[PDB]
Design an enzyme around this catalytic site. Sequence first.
Site, PDB file in Angstrom:
ATOM      1  N   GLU A 126     112.620  -6.671 -15.377  1.00 34.06           N
ATOM      2  CA  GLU A 126     111.279  -6.824 -14.638  1.00 34.06           C
ATOM      3  C   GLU A 126     111.993  -8.107 -13.832  1.00 34.06           C
ATOM      4  O   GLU A 126     111.706  -7.483 -12.607  1.00 34.06           O
ATOM      5  CB  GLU A 126     109.780  -7.119 -14.694  1.00 34.06           C
ATOM      6  CG  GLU A 126     108.592  -7.138 -13.902  1.00 34.06           C
ATOM      7  CD  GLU A 126     107.716  -8.265 -13.395  1.00 34.06           C
ATOM      8  OE1 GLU A 126     107.460  -8.769 -12.591  1.00 34.06           O
ATOM      9  OE2 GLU A 126     107.448  -7.482 -14.666  1.00 34.06           O
ATOM     10  N   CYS A 197      99.355  -9.341 -13.240  1.00 28.89           N
ATOM     11  CA  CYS A 197      98.631  -7.996 -13.048  1.00 28.89           C
ATOM     12  C   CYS A 197      97.195  -8.028 -13.403  1.00 28.89           C
ATOM     13  O   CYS A 197      96.936  -9.683 -14.753  1.00 28.89           O
ATOM     14  CB  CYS A 197      98.888  -6.667 -13.315  1.00 28.89           C
ATOM     15  SG  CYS A 197      98.984  -7.079 -15.577  1.00 28.89           S
ATOM     16  N   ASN A 227     104.265  -9.874 -22.529  1.00 28.86           N
ATOM     17  CA  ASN A 227     102.838  -9.981 -22.414  1.00 28.86           C
ATOM     18  C   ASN A 227     102.367 -10.544 -23.938  1.00 28.86           C
ATOM     19  O   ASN A 227     101.398 -11.278 -24.186  1.00 28.86           O
ATOM     20  CB  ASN A 227     102.678  -8.942 -21.494  1.00 28.86           C
ATOM     21  CG  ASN A 227     101.973  -7.981 -22.582  1.00 28.86           C
ATOM     22  OD1 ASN A 227     101.307  -7.916 -22.985  1.00 28.86           O
ATOM     23  ND2 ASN A 227     103.174  -6.750 -22.427  1.00 28.86           N
ATOM     24  N   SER A 269     101.403  -2.982 -24.040  1.00 27.82           N
ATOM     25  CA  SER A 269     102.544  -1.867 -24.661  1.00 27.82           C
ATOM     26  C   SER A 269     102.267  -1.495 -26.052  1.00 27.82           C
ATOM     27  O   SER A 269     102.392  -0.251 -26.769  1.00 27.82           O
ATOM     28  CB  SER A 269     104.061  -2.786 -24.705  1.00 27.82           C
ATOM     29  OG  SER A 269     103.749  -2.697 -23.323  1.00 27.82           O
TER      30      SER A 269
HETATM   31  C1  0O3 Z   1     105.342  -1.742 -19.351  1.00 28.32           C
HETATM   32  C2  0O3 Z   1     105.272  -3.095 -18.310  1.00 28.32           C
HETATM   33  C3  0O3 Z   1     105.682  -3.961 -16.840  1.00 28.32           C
HETATM   34  O1  0O3 Z   1     104.844  -4.546 -16.639  1.00 28.32           O
HETATM   35  C4  0O3 Z   1     104.578  -3.916 -19.087  1.00 28.32           C
HETATM   36  C5  0O3 Z   1     103.624  -4.312 -20.242  1.00 28.32           C
HETATM   37  O2  0O3 Z   1     104.873  -3.734 -21.319  1.00 28.32           O
HETATM   38  P1  0O3 Z   1     105.864  -4.347 -21.521  1.00 28.32           P
HETATM   39  O3  0O3 Z   1     106.637  -3.091 -21.676  1.00 28.32           O
HETATM   40  O4  0O3 Z   1     105.201  -5.043 -23.249  1.00 28.32           O
HETATM   41  O5  0O3 Z   1     106.705  -5.351 -20.547  1.00 28.32           O
HETATM   42  P2  0O3 Z   1     106.854  -7.027 -20.483  1.00 28.32           P
HETATM   43  O6  0O3 Z   1     107.945  -6.750 -21.618  1.00 28.32           O
HETATM   44  O7  0O3 Z   1     106.807  -7.300 -19.398  1.00 28.32           O
HETATM   45  O8  0O3 Z   1     105.072  -7.500 -20.950  1.00 28.32           O
HETATM   46  S1  SF4 Z   2     102.529  -1.515 -16.757  1.00 28.03           S
HETATM   47 FE1  SF4 Z   2     100.671  -2.983 -17.709  1.00 28.03          FE
HETATM   48  S2  SF4 Z   2     100.971  -5.291 -17.844  1.00 28.03           S
HETATM   49 FE2  SF4 Z   2     102.812  -4.547 -16.230  1.00 28.03          FE
HETATM   50  S3  SF4 Z   2     102.527  -4.645 -14.503  1.00 28.03           S
HETATM   51 FE3  SF4 Z   2     101.460  -2.886 -15.253  1.00 28.03          FE
HETATM   52  S4  SF4 Z   2      99.466  -2.977 -15.575  1.00 28.03           S
HETATM   53 FE4  SF4 Z   2     100.642  -4.680 -15.423  1.00 28.03          FE
END
Ligand code: 0O3
Ligand code: SF4
Length: 309
Positions: A126, A197, A227, A269
């Site tokens: 990210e 978020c 997360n 996730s």
């Molecule tokens: C899909 C995401 C984008 O914020 C976050 C929620 O899922 P995840 O794939 O577990 O991402 P994180 O490693 O950023 O927590």
């Molecule tokens: S994917 Fe889920 S945890 Fe990551 S920013 Fe979007 S709503 Fe938040």
Amino acid sequence: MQILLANPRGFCAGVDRAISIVENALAIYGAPIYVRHEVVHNRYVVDSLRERGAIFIEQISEVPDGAILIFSAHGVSQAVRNEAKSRDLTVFDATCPLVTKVHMEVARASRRGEESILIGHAGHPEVEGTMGQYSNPEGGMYLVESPDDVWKLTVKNEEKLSFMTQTTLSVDDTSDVIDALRKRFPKIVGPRKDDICYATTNRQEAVRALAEQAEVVLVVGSKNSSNSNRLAELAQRMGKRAFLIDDAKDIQEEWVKEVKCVGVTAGASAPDILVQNVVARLQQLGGGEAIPLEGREENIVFEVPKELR
Ligand SMILES: C=C(CO)CCOP(=O)(O)OP(=O)(O)O
Ligand code: SF4
């Protein structure tokens, strides 16, 4: 042994959309569908999709000409989107809208030649995507993880400065970093609080309530889920033993021996079937009916692109 379930837990709107994007692509166009990076950070979701013919790669150079390519929920840099664009590829973007929102602000600052600071963790995809929205050589884009990083940063023009955040951080640690940024750079501009978020805030609030009642907390989520790691950490800092586990097979009997109350939650996730199997295992080890805690209502849904209905 009482089993408690946090609320909310499990899928957020961005993950649900990203998974549906890859499932519908596979359905409309048939296999293979290439996906850059794990679509979300969950081993079970990634294996399910790979076993259905999604192929997960790290670089656009691994994708053959003619192919369909999906960007992961974490988002991608401009350079990536450009390499895909210059190639012979059909692209669908699974980036979470809430990540895209931060991207648009970085891009706005870049256009303005005004410097920006991201709070986030080095090397996370990210962070690479959001840092990679900045290209104006005349300003700058700096990453900080902690107050100590803030205390060492120097920027070119501290009168024209803004900050953004990764979506999945500790609400509490991020608050500390912002307090540092504002003391060091009194004219820095940002959102009212941060870019964490709604799903990350609510699951932290929920695991706080869970840890108040439970002696042990199990967090269903993969090792590379940012997360999910924040949920386990939170519980640990409240002095509860907390374990991050992909599935029921990871549960060690010692972890719950002579425990009177165990809590279970799931990162954004992690599919609910994994929590059900965890509960089933806890029950084998002596727990009773899983009781859900009362929780903040979530009502947001993000639809797939109309081309992928
Ligand atoms: C899909 C995401 C984008 O914020 C976050 C929620 O899922 P995840 O794939 O577990 O991402 P994180 O490693 O950023 O927590
Ligand atoms: S994917 Fe889920 S945890 Fe990551 S920013 Fe979007 S709503 Fe938040």
